[PDB]
Design an enzyme around this catalytic site. Structure first.
Site, mmCIF file in Angstrom:
data_model
loop_
_atom_site.group_PDB
_atom_site.id
_atom_site.type_symbol
_atom_site.label_atom_id
_atom_site.label_comp_id
_atom_site.label_asym_id
_atom_site.label_seq_id
_atom_site.Cartn_x
_atom_site.Cartn_y
_atom_site.Cartn_z
ATOM 1 N N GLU A 1 0.841 -1.198 0.000
ATOM 2 C CA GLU A 1 0.000 0.000 0.000
ATOM 3 C C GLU A 1 0.881 1.254 0.000
ATOM 4 O OE1 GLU A 1 -3.411 2.391 2.505
ATOM 5 O OE2 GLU A 1 -2.989 0.357 3.236
HETATM 6 N N1 LIG Z 1 -14.806 11.627 0.830
HETATM 7 C C1 LIG Z 1 -13.640 11.628 1.479
HETATM 8 N N2 LIG Z 1 -12.517 11.945 0.793
HETATM 9 C C2 LIG Z 1 -11.352 11.993 1.449
HETATM 10 N N3 LIG Z 1 -11.111 11.773 2.746
HETATM 11 C C3 LIG Z 1 -12.241 11.460 3.402
HETATM 12 C C4 LIG Z 1 -13.512 11.357 2.858
HETATM 13 N N4 LIG Z 1 -14.435 11.009 3.832
HETATM 14 C C5 LIG Z 1 -13.718 10.925 4.924
HETATM 15 N N5 LIG Z 1 -12.385 11.194 4.743
HETATM 16 C C6 LIG Z 1 -11.339 11.256 5.768
HETATM 17 O O1 LIG Z 1 -10.245 10.466 5.349
HETATM 18 C C7 LIG Z 1 -10.203 9.229 6.099
HETATM 19 C C8 LIG Z 1 -10.223 8.064 5.142
HETATM 20 O O2 LIG Z 1 -9.207 8.257 4.138
HETATM 21 P P1 LIG Z 1 -8.975 7.176 2.974
HETATM 22 O O3 LIG Z 1 -8.087 7.751 1.934
HETATM 23 O O4 LIG Z 1 -10.322 6.804 2.345
HETATM 24 O O5 LIG Z 1 -8.302 5.883 3.591
HETATM 25 P P2 LIG Z 1 -8.855 4.418 3.809
HETATM 26 O O6 LIG Z 1 -8.848 3.702 2.518
HETATM 27 O O7 LIG Z 1 -10.333 4.484 4.372
HETATM 28 N N6 LIG Z 1 -7.895 3.623 4.884
HETATM 29 P P3 LIG Z 1 -6.900 2.332 4.655
HETATM 30 O O8 LIG Z 1 -7.682 1.065 4.817
HETATM 31 O O9 LIG Z 1 -5.797 2.376 5.663
HETATM 32 O O10 LIG Z 1 -6.314 2.388 3.276
HETATM 33 C C9 LIG Z 1 -11.383 9.264 7.070
HETATM 34 O O11 LIG Z 1 -11.038 8.692 8.327
HETATM 35 C C10 LIG Z 1 -11.722 10.756 7.162
HETATM 36 O O12 LIG Z 1 -10.967 11.432 8.162
HETATM 37 MG MG LIG Z 2 -6.787 3.774 1.313
#
Ligand SMILES: Nc1ncnc2c1ncn2[C@@H]1O[C@H](COP(=O)(O)OP(=O)(O)NP(=O)(O)O)[C@@H](O)[C@H]1O
Ligand SMILES: [Mg+2]
Ligand SMILES: [Mg+2]
Lengths: 592, 593
Positions: free
Chosen positions: B200
Site C-alpha cells: 500500500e
Molecule cells: N470523501 C472523502 N474523501 C477523502 N477523505 C475522506 C472522505 N471522507 C472521509 N475522509 C477522511 O479520510 C479518512 C479516510 O481516508 P482514505 O483515503 O479513504 O483511507 P482508507 O482507505 O479508508 N484507509 P486504509 O484502509 O488504511 O487504506 C477518514 O477517516 C476521514 O478522516
Molecule cells: Mg486507502
C-alpha cells in the site's frame, strides 16, 4: 577525534566500493575472427570488441567497439584446395573428362588432410597476430572468453560443381573446433558462422559495414529517431555500396520511402529477412552480385570475347582498345607481368590463367551444363565451347599477339556489350537472375535510389586516383560521367615509351607502367559505363564517393570496407542468440 | 501536368503502406477499486494503448489519468460483519464462534457481496458514460476493462478465513458483469487481492514519483553511468499517507546507507515491483494500524480518558479539543450541531473504537493463542475478556471537556500513538520489518530524500494555519514554526453565536466556523509536529517536506490523485510481456463459456 572519524568513512567506502563491484557491469576484451575465403586467396581477419556483462542481463558486444587489428597473410584459395584434391584423387585433367562424383566419397579423409594444411597456416597466422598486438592483461581476457571464428567463402567456390564444396565446409568446421591447445586461444565455430555466403549476403554485409563505420546505421538517438507513430528512422540517409572483387561485383543500395518495384524484382527487408534486429531502423535493400565481373574474372572474359570478334582480330593480331599505345603481349588470359625492359611476360600456367574458373564451370561434364541448355548457350556466347578440352577453352583461337590501340571510347563500347549489358547473362549468375537482374544495365533500369553510393575496390579507386594525381580530375570529384570520360580518354590515348627507367606512360606528366596499371583503362571504362546507368535510372544518387576505408571518431580507421564487419554485426546484434551460442555454448561445446 | 496526377495515386499507396507499417493508438479504461477501511469506492482511469506490428500492445505510463473517483459505498468489513450478524448470530464479538460451521453460509456471503458489486459496477458505468464520447466508448468497450480491487486496513486485521473466501467471490462477480452496458470488465487473483501495508505504501511511492516526473526509464528522467547502471536524474521522493485505519511511512534509501539486520528494506527490482529497465532503489515501506484518522481518534479517547491525569469525577479533560467544547464520553461519530452542541452517535457500527474492540476479543484466535497480542490490547485499555459494548465503553466517564493545551496534546499523541510502550494492536507486519512504532522508523532508518504528506486532515492542519496568517505562504516544514502557530490556534476559545459555533483566535487574530471536520484537528496538528520531530531527530534529514493533495500534470491540470491507485496500475502495466498476456491475450474473452 578528527582522524578517528576519518578512518570510519574509509571502511564505509571500502564496503561501498565492494558493493558497487557486485552490482555494476564489467567490461572484458574479446577477439573475433572472420576468415575471408575469397577467389584469389584465403586470409584471416582478426578483430577486437569490448564485451559487457551485467547482473541478470548476461554478456553482449558493443557494436561501435568492433575494430580490425590486422588482415593476415594471403594463403591458398578454397578452389585451389578442392582442384588439387581432384587432380590427385579423380585424376589429372578431370576438367575435360567425365568424372563419377560417387567414387570421390572414398577420398574424404584425403580431403581433410588438404584442408588441414591450409587451416594450420591460418591458425598459426591468427595466433601470431594476437601474440604481437595483445598485452598479457588483454591475452587473459581474450583466452578466457573464447574466439568465435566465421569462415565465409565467396565467388571462389560459389560456382563449384557437385557436393565437394559443402563436404569441405563440414571438414573446415571440425578443424576450427579442434585447435592447438598450446597457444591458449579458444577458437570455435558452428554451421551458422562458418558457411558459404551468397552473393546477395556478401553485398548486404558490405552495406552493413559501410553504414556502421560511417555512423549512418544505429539504434541509439544519435543515429536514429522515433516519429510520432512509433517508427524508428535513421537520422542520416543510408548509403549504398559497389564492391568489385577478384571474381564478382556487388551492387547494393537501400530503397527510399519504399519505392514500388516490379513483381520479378526481389528486394530484401533487413528486419524481415533477419539481417538486423527489430530495434534497428528498417530498410528494403536491393542486393545483387554478378559473377565474371570481378577484377581477374572480367580480365579473362574480356580478352576471350574481344579477340573472338572479327572487328578486333586480324591476322593473329588482336587490337585491344583498353590497352595503351605501344603495349604488346601474348594472346592468352594468363597473368601478365610487366618486366623492367618494357616486355609483358604472360604466364601460361593453367592455375594462373584468368579464364580457368570460367572454363572449369563451362564443361559438358559439369551437370549445370549437360542437363541445362541455357547455361551451355551462356558459355558458347562468351566463346567458351563446353565440349572442347580445358586447354582449348582457355585458348584464344587463331590469335598470337595482343596489341594496344589506346582508344577509350572503343574500350567503353566493348566493356558495355561484353561485361555490363550482354545479350545473354554471364555464366554462373542464376542468383542475380532470380533477383530479377540478368545484367548490370538491368539493375538501375528496374530499381533506382536517391541514396549516396560508395565505390569500393583496389582498381576502382586506382582508376580515380591516377587521374586525380595527373590533374586530369578535380580533388573534389562528385562522380560526373562526362568529367571522368574526358579525363580517362586523354589518359588512355597516351604512348608507352620504353626508357632506361623502364616502361613509362607519356602524357602531355609521366607515370611508370606496371602489372597493376597496364589494363586500368578497362576498369576506367567500367566506372564510366556503371555511372552512365546510375545517371540513366529514374532516381539518381545524392553523391558518388570512392573510399578504401572509413575513418573512425579518433581520426584513425576502425576497420576496412567489405563483408567482414557486416557478418559480425549480423550475429552479435541479436543479443539473446549471440549470448547462447558464443557464451552459453562457447568453446566448452567442443569438449569431449 | 500528369506528373502531379500520378503523384496522387502514388501518395494513395504510400498512405495505405504507412497505416500497415505504423503503430495505432487506441483508448483503454482501467479500474482500481479502493476497498479501504472507511468505504469501498471505484477509481476510473484512462490510458493510451499502442499496438505495433510484431511488438504487440502496451500502455503509455505517462498517459495514465484519473477521470473520477466514484461514490463511497459500504466497506468490506461491514459486508462481512453483517453476514456474521445474520449467519453466526448477533453479538458474535462477545461469544465463541465456530468458523467451520460458517462454511454452509458461503452462497449467502455471495449475495451480500453481489449487492455491493452491483453498486460499484453501476457507478463505474455512470462515470464512463458521462466522460467518454461515442468514438471513445467503442475503443474502451473493444479492448476490455482490467479491474483491480485491493483491500487495505479495513479487512487487514480480519479474523479467520472469511476475508480470503470473500475475495474468491468478489473476482467471480467482476468477471461476470451486466452485458447490457457493453463495458467488458475482467479480473484475476493477481489484480484483485488484499494488498499488504508495505505494498500500500510502496504503490503510493510509485504514484508520487511517476506523477512528479522523478521516476522514469527514458533519458529525460534517467541516466546511464559508465558502468551500465541506470540512475534517476532527480532524487526520488518519499511519502507519508494517513488514511482511515492506517498510516504509511515510505522513503527511498539514498547512497550506501547501511541498515541493521532486523530492519528490512525493499529493492523495487529484486521484489518485482518495477521492471529491470527502471532505475533501482532500496525503499523502506512501513504501515501502522490504529494510526489512520478514524482508528486513531477512537484509540486516543480510550487511552487519554483511562489515565488518572485526565479523568476526574467522570469529566475527561482533552488537550486536543478547543476551550468551551463539550461532548459525551464515547468514541462514536461526533456531529457539530448549529447550536454549538456535539451530537455523539452511540451506534456500534458508527463507533470509531469498533474495529479495535472486534480485533481485541478472547474469541479471536490471534488473542486466545497469542498472549503478546492480549497485552497489546490491555495496555490500550481494551479488555478482550469483556463484552464488545464494555470494550468500546470509556469506563467511569460521562463528559469530555476541551482544555485547548497544544503542548499537552503533543505529549499525549506521542505516548499513545507515535511512541507507545508496546506496539499498537494488529501491527505484526510493521514489527517484522523492524519497526514496532513511528519513533523507531527514523531512529533505525533515515533518508535525505524529500517527503510528501497526504491525507485530508494532514493538509487541513497546514492550510488552516496558512489561512489565518499563522504560517508563511512558503512553508518548508519547520517543526517549531508549526508548533508555535498551532499552539496559538489550539488555545482558541469557542463562542456559540447566532450563526453557530465560532473559533475565536487569541489577540484578535481572526475567526472561522466550527464543524464536524475541524473540532479535533488539533490532534492531527500535534501528530504532524511529533512526526516532523522524529524526521529532524534522524541521522539523515529530508531536503524539504511538502504538503500536497494532487500532483499537477504537464498541461497544468492534475493527471491523477495521490495514493496507491496509480502505483498498482504501473506495477502491472510496466511488465510489457506479462501485461499483454493477461490483459490482451487472455482478456475478458477468458471469462467466456
Ligand atoms: N470523501 C472523502 N474523501 C477523502 N477523505 C475522506 C472522505 N471522507 C472521509 N475522509 C477522511 O479520510 C479518512 C479516510 O481516508 P482514505 O483515503 O479513504 O483511507 P482508507 O482507505 O479508508 N484507509 P486504509 O484502509 O488504511 O487504506 C477518514 O477517516 C476521514 O478522516
Ligand atoms: Mg486507502
Ligand atoms: Mg571479397
Amino acid at each position: 577525534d578528527a582522524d578517528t572519524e576519518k578512518r570510519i568513512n574509509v571502511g564505509k567506502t571500502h564496503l561501498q566500493t565492494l558493493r558497487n563491484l557486485e552490482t555494476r557491469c564489467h567490461d572484458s576484451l574479446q577477439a573475433l575472427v572472420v576468415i575471408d575465403a575469397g577467389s584469389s586467396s584465403t586470409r584471416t581477419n582478426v578483430f577486437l570488441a569490448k564485451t559487457r556483462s551485467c547482473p541478470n542481463k548476461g554478456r553482449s558486444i558493443d557494436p561501435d567497439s568492433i575494430q580490425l587489428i590486422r588482415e593476415g597473410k594471403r594463403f591458398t584459395g578454397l578452389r585451389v584446395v578442392l582442384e588439387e584434391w581432384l587432380d590427385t584423387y579423380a585424376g589429372k585433367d578431370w576438367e575435360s573428362r567425365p568424372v563419377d562424383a560417387r567414387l570421390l566419397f572414398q577420398y574424404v579423409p584425403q580431403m581433410h588432410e588438404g584442408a588441414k594444411k591450409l587451416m594450420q597456416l591460418l591458425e598459426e597466422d591468427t595466433v601470431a597476430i594476437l601474440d604481437s598486438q595483445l598485452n598479457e592483461e588483454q591475452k587473459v581476457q581474450v583466452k578466457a572468453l573464447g574466439i568465435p571464428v566465421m569462415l565465409c567463402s565467396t565467388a571462389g567456390v560459389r560456382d563449384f560443381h557437385e557436393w565437394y564444396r559443402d563436404a569441405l565446409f563440414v571438414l573446415l568446421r571440425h578443424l576450427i573446433n579442434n585447435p592447438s591447445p598450446a597457444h591458449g586461444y579458444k577458437f570455435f565455430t558452428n554451421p551458422f558462422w562458418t558457411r558459404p555466403i551468397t552473393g546477395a549476403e556478401e553485398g548486404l554485409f558490405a552495406f552493413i559495414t559501410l553504414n556502421h563505420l560511417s555512423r549512418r546505421l544505429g539504434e541509439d538517438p544519435a543515429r536514429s529517431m522515433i516519429d510520432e507513430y512509433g517508427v524508428k528512422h535513421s537520422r542520416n540517409d543510408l548509403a549504398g555500396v559497389v564492391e568489385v572483387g577478384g571474381a564478382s561485383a556487388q551492387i547494393v543500395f537501400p530503397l527510399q520511402e519504399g519505392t514500388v518495384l516490379p513483381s520479378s524484382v526481389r528486394a530484401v527487408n533487413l528486419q524481415r529477412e533477419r539481417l538486423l534486429p527489430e530495434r534497428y531502423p528498417s530498410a528494403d535493400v536491393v542486393s545483387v552480385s554478378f559473377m565474371q565481373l570481378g577484377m581477374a574474372s572480367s580480365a579473362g572474359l574480356f580478352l576471350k570475347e574481344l579477340c573472338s570478334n572479327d572487328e578486333f582480330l586480324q591476322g593473329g593480331i588482336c587490337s585491344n582498345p583498353c590497352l595503351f599505345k605501344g603495349f604488346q603481349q601474348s594472346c592468352s588470359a594468363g597473368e601478365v607481368e610487366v618486366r623492367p625492359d618494357g616486355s609483358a611476360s604472360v604466364n601460361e600456367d593453367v592455375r594462373k590463367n584468368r579464364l580457368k574458373p570460367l572454363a572449369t564451370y563451362c564443361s559438358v561434364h559439369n551437370p549445370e551444363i549437360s542437363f541445362k541448355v541455357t547455361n551451355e548457350m551462356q558459355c558458347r556466347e562468351n566463346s567458351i565451347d563446353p565440349t572442347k578440352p580445358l586447354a582449348e577453352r582457355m585458348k584464344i583461337e587463331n590469335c598470337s599477339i595482343i596489341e594496344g590501340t589506346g582508344n577509350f571510347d572503343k574500350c567503353v563500347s566493348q566493356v558495355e556489350s561484353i561485361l555490363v549489358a550482354p545479350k545473354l547473362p554471364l555464366p554462373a549468375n542464376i542468383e542475380a537472375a532470380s533477383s530479377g537482374f540478368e545484367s548490370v544495365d538491368q539493375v538501375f533500369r528496374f530499381a533506382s535510389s536517391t541514396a549516396p553510393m560508395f565505390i569500393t575496390g583496389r582498381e576502382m579507386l586506382a582508376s580515380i586516383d591516377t587521374l586525380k594525381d595527373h590533374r586530369l580530375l578535380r580533388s573534389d570529384f562528385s562522380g560526373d560521367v562526362e568529367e571522368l570520360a574526358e579525363a580517362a580518354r586523354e589518359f588512355c590515348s597516351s604512348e608507352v615509351i620504353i626508357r632506361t627507367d623502364g616502361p613509362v606512360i607519356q602524357l602531355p606528366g609521366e607515370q611508370k607502367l606496371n602489372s597493376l596499371n597496364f589494363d586500368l583503362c578497362k576498369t576506367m571504362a567500367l566506372t564510366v559505363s556503371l555511372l552512365r546507368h546510375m545517371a540513366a535510372g529514374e532516381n539518381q544518387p545524392s553523391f558518388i564517393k570512392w573510399e578504401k576505408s572509413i575513418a573512425g571518431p579518433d581520426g584513425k580507421p576502425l576497420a576496412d570496407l567489405g563483408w567482414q564487419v557486416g557478418v559480425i554485426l549480423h550475429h552479435v546484434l541479436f543479443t539473446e542468440e549471440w549470448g547462447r551460442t558464443a557464451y552459453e555454448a562457447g568453446y566448452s561445446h567442443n569438449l569431449e
